[PDB]
Amino acid sequence: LLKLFTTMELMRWSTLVEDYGMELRKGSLESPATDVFGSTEEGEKRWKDLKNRVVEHNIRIMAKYYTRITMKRMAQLLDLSVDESEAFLSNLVVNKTIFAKVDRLAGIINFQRPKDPNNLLNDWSQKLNSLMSLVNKTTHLIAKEEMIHNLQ
Amino acid sequence: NRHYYSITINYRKNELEQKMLLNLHKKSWMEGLTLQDYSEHCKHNESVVKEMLELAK
């Protein structure tokens, strides 16, 4: 649960293989894992849908970051094919990846770098940067000016 | 006005009232560090006032 909680480091599911396997083996707790695999196809749908759901979820986590993990490298670190990464992109176009950048030339993607209107976006960055510099500059200024009063 | 008259009124203002009330009122129309709301409207020239520029046209 805490690994599914937030800020998911891209982790190996082979580490989850022994977790789910002994999660079938032990009858100490959560005995109906064999009931999760109860139907011949349904637990397989839960399983491929499960690996699918986390392998989309972590992409939505690193999609917050603009750090550009360069998905041709990511498909190599994931040890999975880029064709099912195109299938992952078919899950992304219905998962609304619609604000992104792909390449005919490269295979590296960008989740950002919009058209960037300077009357909107660099407007906004310049606004909160300048203003927060001004008023954060304002407060501890007079506050430390009150702190030096107590040394007298 | 019969049986009932009036008297003139003048004032007095010393320089502490003058400059205290004056910088009090200019400061009541100015900002704290005073550089604060400048870039705000400089960049509302890019966000808001462009609409008022088109409506002006």
UniProtKB/Swiss-Prot annotation, chain A:
Residues 1-116 form the PCI domain. The modification N6-acetyllysine is found at residue 64. It comes from the Eukaryota. Transmembrane segments: none annotated. Belongs to the proteasome subunit p55 family. Component of the 26S proteasome, a multiprotein complex involved in the ATP-dependent degradation of ubiquitinated proteins. This complex plays a key role in the maintenance of protein homeostasis by removing misfolded or damaged proteins, which could impair cellular functions, and by removing proteins whose functions are no longer required. Therefore, the proteasome participates in numerous cellular processes, including cell cycle progression, apoptosis, or DNA damage repair. Component of the 19S proteasome regulatory particle complex. The 26S proteasome consists of a 20S core particle (CP) and two 19S regulatory subunits (RP). The regulatory particle is made of a lid composed of 9 subunits including PSMD12, a base containing 6 ATPases and few additional components. Interacts with ERCC6. It is linked to Stankiewicz-Isidor syndrome: A neurodevelopmental disorder characterized by delayed psychomotor development, intellectual disability, behavioral disorders, mild dysmorphism, ophthalmologic anomalies, feeding difficulties, deafness, and variable congenital malformations of the cardiac and/or urogenital systems. This is 26S proteasome non-ATPase regulatory subunit 12. It comes from Homo sapiens.
UniProtKB/Swiss-Prot annotation, chain B:
Widely expressed. Highest levels in heart and skeletal muscle. The chain holds residues 197 to 253 of 310 of the full protein. Component of the 19S proteasome regulatory particle complex. The 26S proteasome consists of a 20S core particle (CP) and two 19S regulatory subunits (RP). The regulatory particle is made of a lid composed of 9 subunits including PSMD4, a base containing 6 ATPases and few additional components. Within the complex, PSMD4 interacts with subunit PSMD7 through their respective MPN domain. Interacts with TXNL1. Signal peptide: none annotated. This is 26S proteasome non-ATPase regulatory subunit 14. Component of the 26S proteasome, a multiprotein complex involved in the ATP-dependent degradation of ubiquitinated proteins. This complex plays a key role in the maintenance of protein homeostasis by removing misfolded or damaged proteins, which could impair cellular functions, and by removing proteins whose functions are no longer required. Therefore, the proteasome participates in numerous cellular processes, including cell cycle progression, apoptosis, or DNA damage repair. It comes from Homo sapiens. Belongs to the peptidase M67A family. PSMD14 subfamily. The lineage of its organism: Eukaryota, Metazoa, Chordata, Craniata, Vertebrata. The modification Phosphoserine is found at residue 28. It comes from the Eukaryota.
